[PDB]
Amino acid sequence: ITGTSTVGVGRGVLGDQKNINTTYSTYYYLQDNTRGNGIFTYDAKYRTTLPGSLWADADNQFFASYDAPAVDAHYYAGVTYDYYKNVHNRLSYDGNNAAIRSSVHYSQGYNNAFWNGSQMVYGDGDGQTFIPLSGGIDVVAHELTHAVTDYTAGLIYQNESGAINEAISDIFGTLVEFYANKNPDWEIGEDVYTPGISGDSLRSMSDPAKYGDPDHYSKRYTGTQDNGGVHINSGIINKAAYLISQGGTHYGVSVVGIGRDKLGKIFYRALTQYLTPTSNFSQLRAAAVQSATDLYGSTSQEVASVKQAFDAVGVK
Ligand SMILES: O[C@@H]1[C@@H](O)[C@H](O)OC[C@H]1O
Ligand SMILES: O[C@@H]1[C@@H](O)[C@H](O)OC[C@H]1O
Ligand SMILES: O[C@@H]1[C@@H](O)[C@H](O)OC[C@H]1O
Ligand SMILES: O[C@@H]1[C@@H](O)[C@H](O)OC[C@H]1O
Ligand SMILES: O[C@@H]1[C@@H](O)[C@H](O)OC[C@H]1O
Ligand SMILES: O[C@@H]1[C@@H](O)[C@H](O)OC[C@H]1O
Ligand SMILES: O[C@@H]1[C@@H](O)[C@H](O)OC[C@H]1O
Ligand SMILES: [Ca+2]
Ligand SMILES: [Ca+2]
Ligand SMILES: [Cl-]
Ligand SMILES: [Cl-]
Ligand SMILES: [Cl-]
Ligand SMILES: [Cl-]
Ligand SMILES: [Zn+2]
Ligand SMILES: [Zn+2]
Ligand SMILES: [Zn+2]
Ligand SMILES: [Zn+2]
Ligand SMILES: [Zn+2]
Ligand SMILES: [Zn+2]
Ligand SMILES: [Zn+2]
Ligand SMILES: [Zn+2]
């Protein structure tokens, strides 16, 4: 809509206050004109029609419980935009400042959130398995990173390529969570999963086995469920990424940690320059090694640590 750029205030899913960029034309709309071609957040009104209505509010105050999913979808899309622009010089998910559109209150009791090829879609959860999923910055950035992948390497969504696709989204979801630097960790979805249970999450990057996911290539899932285990086998790559950043000793292999920023630079370069739709784990290792070589030199600690981490998880 055409209007004046304004700044509203509200509370997110977890009760935290934050400012949001809005547009004023009779109503205050969740339309942030400060980032690229805009960030737009929509009310799906418990339907499955998309995108729904551009979110309208009478007073630029967003403290109602019904507002909270919209506040967080809008704000965390902004954080994700800021991460990709400030850290990687990438303008929105397509690198060409595409508008970021999000719909909240999608369907009823819907325990999922997804990038659908042109926008983000957030269920409210059923209140037991999940609360509204836009409350999780890592979920928001995980799904928007699928769009990044789609516009770069094009990793399919099955078998090893799909597990890399998933891990890439977990890695950058987590790096966005650290960039926001409110309550970061190496867990996925902890803020919105199981409100009755403290200390759990959908999966752990630092210890995938905590939830039964593999932390070594020899433990990879080879069945047909979950598109060949894409959310399961991602633990193998997630653990390698965790080791690259934080270091550690894993199955007897010592990894010297190089920190989060270099982890992100290495994997971003691998994703955008070297991966292809059918890259497998071994090819991801090669891409990460070459990316670290490009950035830091073949004799660098960074290259050596990439190799150590993939050795530790059994990927040659
Ligand atoms: O409403 C305006 C918006 O449509 C435009 O894109 O950028 C400036 C805004 O104030
Ligand atoms: O924590 C990371 C920060 O250290 C780096 O500067 O850029 C990415 C962030 O996630
Ligand atoms: O977040 C990590 C945590 O999972 C681990 O237990 O201790 C080190 C941290 O980096
Ligand atoms: O020890 C873990 C176990 O507690 C869980 O039930 O399944 C996965 C294992 O890694
Ligand atoms: O062969 C693998 C071994 O090298 C490693 O130590 O742990 C898992 C095994 O499958
Ligand atoms: O069966 C597949 C297995 O061969 C591969 O290694 O990892 C993904 C699985 O789907
Ligand atoms: O196969 C790819 C290779 O061509 C390139 O050199 O680095 C990435 C690899 O995965
Ligand atoms: Ca997290
Ligand atoms: Ca929980
Ligand atoms: Cl560990
Ligand atoms: Cl471990
Ligand atoms: Cl460790
Ligand atoms: Cl271990
Ligand atoms: Zn209001
Ligand atoms: Zn998803
Ligand atoms: Zn995903
Ligand atoms: Zn967290
Ligand atoms: Zn899955
Ligand atoms: Zn998923
Ligand atoms: Zn270990
Ligand atoms: Zn460990």
- In terms of C-beta density within 10 A (0-12 exposed, 13-18 middle, 19 or more buried), how is residue 89 classed? exposed
| Beta carbon of 182 within 6 Å of any ligand 2 atom | no
- Ligand 1 centroid to residue 10 C-alpha, Å: 22
How far, in Å, CA of 197 to CA of 41, rounded? 30
Specify the experimental method: X-ray
Which pair of tokens denotes residue 135? 């409350």
Domain range 155-315, CATH architecture: Orthogonal Bundle (1.10)
> What 3-state DSSP class applies to 76?
helix
Resolution of the PDB structure in angstroms: 1.6
| Beta carbon of 297 within 6 Å of any ligand 4 atom | no
| Beta carbon of 314 within 6 Å of any ligand 5 atom | yes
Residues enclosing ligand 3, CB less than 6 A?
185-186, 206, 246
Q: Any binding-site annotation on 67? A: no
115 DSSP β-pair partners:
120
Residues enclosing ligand 7, CB less than 6 A?
274, 279, 283, 286-287, 290
Residue with tokens 């209150």: 105
How far, in Å, CA of 111 to CA of 87, rounded? 31
Residue with tokens 């309208």: 56
CA nearest neighbour of 155 among 55, 274, 303, 26: 274
Helix 301-312 / helix 260-269 crossing angle, nearest 10 deg? 80
Q: Are 182 and 79 in contact (CB under 8 A)?
A: no
Q: Which residues are catalytic?
A: 143, 231
* Ranges of each domain in the chain: 6-154, 155-315
Domain range 6-154, CATH architecture: Roll (3.10)
How far, in Å, CA of 63 to CA of 15, rounded? 9
| CA distance to 61, 239, 244, 288, per residue, from 302 (Å) | 47, 17, 8, 10
Amino acid making up residue 163 = A
